[PDB]
Design a protein that fits this description.
The structure is a homooctamer.
Chain A: E1 5-9, H1 15-27, E2 32-36, H2 43-52, E3 60-65, H3 71-78, E4 83-87, H4 96-103, E5 112-113, H5 118-132, H6 137-153
Parallel strand pairs in A: 1-2, 1-3, 3-4, 4-5
PDB class: lyase
Keywords: acidophile, PurE, purine biosynthesis, Lyase
Assembly: octameric
């Protein structure tokens, strides 16, 4: 029941993208919390959230943001937990700005970066699942099933 | 002494970059293996490596590649283990081709991507360490100490 | 009747683009098969497809995919046959990511790359036709006719 | 002699670039301080610096950073003072990652961004000077003289 | 009543973006003028506007333009006042062209550059406010309130 | 001994890149010719070359060019033979201008494009070889052997 | 009555953009012809058009194309006349591909390149006008009037 | 001997590039002047130069600039004469900032842009020459001869 994964996003507009991470974790029955945290607008909220994540029992944090997208990197700056970043596609630069500000983190402060957009959000949840699966046999089995279903469900020909 | 992390790279040329991941894992005392495997040039070698990773005891895979970098993604296609990708800098496109080929994975097959180059390799090792630390108290302490030392070692004023 | 060209694509969403390759081959009466094969979601399907292509009588393979687009390159990795790649335009990066992951293949594993989108798909089929025409006089003549009609049909002034 | 401008940079490596801002402020006789502070590596040091900037008498902050450059933006997140950002050129992406990470700030948290590299650092100091000149007649004259000299010093014909 | 900030834009099409700067200054009760000035179409108008800005009592100038966006830099070329630039997103290059022509100004002629689009326009006004706040206690307090309200109003979870 | 592959390039400067295609064809024993022809500077020379390619016995054309690279596309405009394009790396834009000028061909006039630089030239020769191998059993065997040797020659572990 | 400027474009789809060049030349009463010429689909048509342009009395050629946009450069390759190029914005790469294939011409074969899109088309016509104005006093005066009207018509404030 | 072409550049640093335009005009015997004028740093000098160009007898202006290149565009804003722009290669962005700042002119104020760098400067001079050749038979012949010589001078085979 207690969340083991935290999904945080820069703003409400990021939900259209990050909901894909939420849906996937629920599908795999991975207890989690979904919140809005802005690195630039709510810096103290982020500091407190990241600093206390491990204490609260969180094992992985999935962070998504658009524009300069400081959220993922700054979250990683305050927590020892694995942080996965999702560049949110936002208008002018199609998430290219977000991608670079998330993936180009300096040595010492990693952010496992996923694809720009919905696919990245979905994959951040799957990656978080693969991490948790390392020490949760039941989840590992459900993940195996999920991957097997994906592979088996791909059509052989276009419609 | 059995490896829990597997570092794979497409070529000897990628070693200059990936050695930073190897060094960091050794520093944190994380048993691991280091091999050269190319998705584009030794696809069957990759299939065998990735398919058997989990049964061989590996927990995390760190894959480095440049150009039309497919090693991380194809490894992830055959294993359920978390795969971290390191874009190796390319001559003409400065690693942009490497980066996009690795990070833009389709929904359903994740690859946690790090920065282009050495910093990326170092962070891939650190990320793998943070993953393993979730269920290894001793490593967790070694990691905490390492991170804290980094922060405390940052100078306060510039040297002219 | 037996296909001499194989058109494979990463997913159903790629059909809107790859159908242009299908239509062109049919127009030129080039026997072919059109399938969905994902390098990342169905790796074994791709391995088997590419490995056996030559044995099955295929002479050319046209592969299209978006995003990281691993399909064309990995197909070329398993077959000795000429592989032509079509970067599919997909959202965030307008197929620029697909283009680089297809065209920047290492020395030793070529992928003849075409333009991003529908035009690339159409040209992949035309290129496959020009390859087959080298040893099929009847097809060569039909291709000559197709090219001649294209050139002759371009209007002299805008409407 | 109390500092009215604070120049902060993520590392010693950024000094080669940021020293140009330091030199220009000194030339215009603007009291300032120069420190190394990293948003990604010393986040708490940044929080303390930015939170107390205003109460310490600072009027403008010049922040230089490269790569996933978050120093300017996070500083701006904790201070109400105007923050100017200088993108430090990066090896692979030539400062493009630095630039986008700094300029693309969300609405509500501004960072006045200057050019990539040395020219940017110089302009950050000049911009800070023009800000301070609004309420410092003496500085305003020194600035006017400086700008006028620049214009008059531009050659009229090329040397072969 | 007399304007202390001047908002100038390249054309009417830039208003959709620059209106966000206008609205913000009004919200903070910062007296200002909003005008259309084209560096390339009305060079003498810009020269006169920039040259006389300080004399007219202006303290900061916010300039926005799309395309080659020469407006911000050229304005800075003629005034000693702080000039803030807003790259306007315009079609073909999503404001990337505007961004570079504004931010890459040579040493000696600065333009404090903000984000591409509406957010940049809003931030240019906020930056201008933070500059004026240095010598206007009442405004400083209103700005503090604005920033505090922004931080406090960010939702804790997505809807 | 009659050439079945024609390698054309816009200039002597492109030779450093295109020589890799020449070498590979020779290695696989594929008779070919190598010439310099510029679409932008010797358009009539190109027209004559491309128009007569088929009647001269050529089966595949490998065209290398950089900058506003039009050689591959214009060659393809005059011949029905398959044309493979190699983007030659450019000084400022690192071959990006070369790549887009070559790959973005309009529907109806194909140009199979390879990687920027030497690797691209090598792959253009290999692609031409795979095309010719479809109706040349002997070449097919030589190609199979070549590809297999490449795969078997990839090292398994990195040298430090 | 005899055309002194030739406007050529890669295809019918380029008309939406190139019509702006046509309209401008008509507005300035500059006799001209507007045609469709494809460098890749109708190479001989282009060769003949460019080779004979000077003989036919043309003084300037405005060429517009999208994608790889070989039209402008190849036209310049066959004529001694000044060739102005207009990159047409086309889908995947927003005319960035067209821009580079037109502007990066080798030393010895120039193409005066204008902005991507409608503005570029309009400016190509204006540039052609400024060239013709050098030896046509009446046109020079009409151009002066056009430029003066543009400058004078820019609004002072947004609506 | 009165100049009919005016070559202007933002700085001495741009001369290495713009000298190629100067040399070509001299080769074709086109009287011209060469000056340094910066839009961003000597705006009034530019205004005076551009406003008086036509009355001074100039027919074409060739303007070279790098970075936030505004010289060509602002010159065009003050003169009705045709203005050709040459993007000077920049350190970090390799002339991309120069190119976009120059070519993306708004409708109504044209600037005929050439390639980034030396090739661009050479073509700007050649374009100016082709413009002047429209009403200068002698120059037209010199230009025809020059172009023809270029084409005939292109080698037919590569030197190894």
């Amino acid at each position: 029941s207690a969340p083991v994964v935290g999904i945080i996003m820069g703003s409400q507009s990021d939900w259209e993208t990050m909901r894909h991470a939420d849906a996937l974790l629920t599908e795999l029955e991975i207890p989690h919390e979904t919140l809005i945290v802005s690195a630039n607008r709510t810096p103290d909220r982020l500091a407190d959230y990241a600093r206390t994540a491990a204490e609260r029992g969180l094992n992985v944090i999935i962070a998504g943001a658009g524009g300069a997208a400081h959220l993922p990197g700054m979250c990683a700056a305050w927590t020892r937990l694995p942080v996965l970043g999702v560049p949110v596609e936002s208008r002018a630069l199609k998430g290219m700005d977000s991608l670079l500000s998330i993936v180009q983190m300096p040595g010492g402060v990693p952010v496992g970066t996923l694809a720009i957009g919905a696919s990245g959000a979905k994959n951040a949840a799957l990656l978080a699942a693969s991490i948790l699966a390392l020490y949760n046999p039941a989840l590992a089995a459900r993940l195996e099933t999920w991957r097997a279903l994906q592979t088996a469900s791909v059509p052989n020909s276009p419609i």
